[PDB]
């Protein structure tokens, strides 16, 4: 089943953010150098690239329904570009500190940004990118934000304060706070996308990945094996696997039922920072960004 092939890999400066376009065979990379690139990974030709800033751009997503990309950087700013024309649609200071993570609501015109300023902010692009809410309560850098795809009126924030908080849009306190026991903090949080399990997953500098039942708050499993900071861990949308990546230079694929490692890949680009899975499992594509570039893999 698992038959991993390299679709396209290219070298670049450190890739901190990465995302797939849902209908074009494109991947967006956002770099530590302030540059962002959109690649057609089937033709292996650049669609568009932009020197956005001189600071790191840690976060970037497509907003395909608007033909946009949205990026956030260490200069504190969110910028949005039309990927067909190159037009800079908006450019604003979002936080008084680094932006770590951006999430886009699946149907409503909302973007979340998580920041070193200890907050998550909600922006509405149908209201001139107005700040509609600030979510306060975390006590260290907010490293990752993610909507619950099964109920995107709620979202999770993962924080170096060692917690995940789950929030409701329009409400000022978390529905709950998970104490992860990941004492070096949480770098990443993700939701299992299918209706049969209320699961989330967290990755930490403490070398662990943990699976959580968000209804009971129980830790279902702890996945050990990475040898340095775990940058991310995600559930694949269609295959029964979890995919993680680490500053140890490896991607790991784990069985999502037994939680045992199935495959370890060192693709030779040094530290791994970010991950994307194709929205619809097209060719079972995944992509990861590293110190020295990115790779797009077909898993089977």
């Amino acid at each position: 089943k698992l038959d991993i092939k390299k679709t396209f890999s290219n070298r670049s400066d450190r890739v901190k953010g990465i995302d797939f376009h849902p209908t074009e065979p494109w991947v967006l990379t956002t770099l530590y150098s302030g540059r962002v690139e959109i690649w057609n990974y089937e033709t292996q030709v650049e669609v568009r690239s932009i020197q956005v800033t001189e600071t790191p751009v840690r976060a970037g997503k497509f907003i395909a329904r608007k033909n946009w990309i949205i990026v956030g950087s260490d200069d504190f700013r969110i910028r949005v570009f039309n990927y067909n024309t190159g037009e800079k649609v908006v450019d604003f200071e979002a936080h008084p500190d680094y932006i770590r993570s951006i999430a886009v609501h699946p149907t409503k015109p909302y973007v979340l940004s998580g920041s070193d300023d200890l907050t998550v902010k909600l922006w509405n692009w149908e209201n001139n990118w107005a700040l509609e809410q600030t979510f306060e309560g975390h006590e260290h850098f907010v490293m990752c934000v993610a909507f619950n795809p099964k109920d995107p009126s709620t979202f999770a924030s993962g924080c170096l304060d060692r917690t995940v908080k789950v929030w409701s849009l329009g409400q000022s306190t978390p529905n709950f706070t998970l104490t992860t026991g990941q004492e070096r903090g949480v770098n990443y949080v993700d939701y299992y996308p299918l209706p049969d399990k209320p699961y989330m997953i967290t990755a930490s500098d403490d070398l662990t990945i943990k699976i959580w039942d968000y209804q009971t708050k129980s830790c279902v499993a702890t996945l050990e094996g990475h040898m340095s900071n775990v940058s991310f861990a995600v559930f694949h949308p269609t295959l029964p696997i979890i995919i993680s990546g680490s500053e140890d230079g490896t991607l790991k694929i784990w069985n999502s039922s037994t939680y045992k490692v199935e495959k370890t890949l060192n693709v030779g680009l040094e530290r791994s920072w970010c991950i994307a899975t194709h929205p619809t499992g097209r060719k079972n594509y995944i992509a990861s960004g590293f110190d020295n570039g990115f790779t797009v893999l077909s898993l089977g």
């Binding site: 680094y98 850098f141 170096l160």
Partner: peptide
């Protein structure tokens, strides 16, 4: 600044 990388 922690997590500068």
């Amino acid at each position: 600044k922690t997590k500068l990388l």
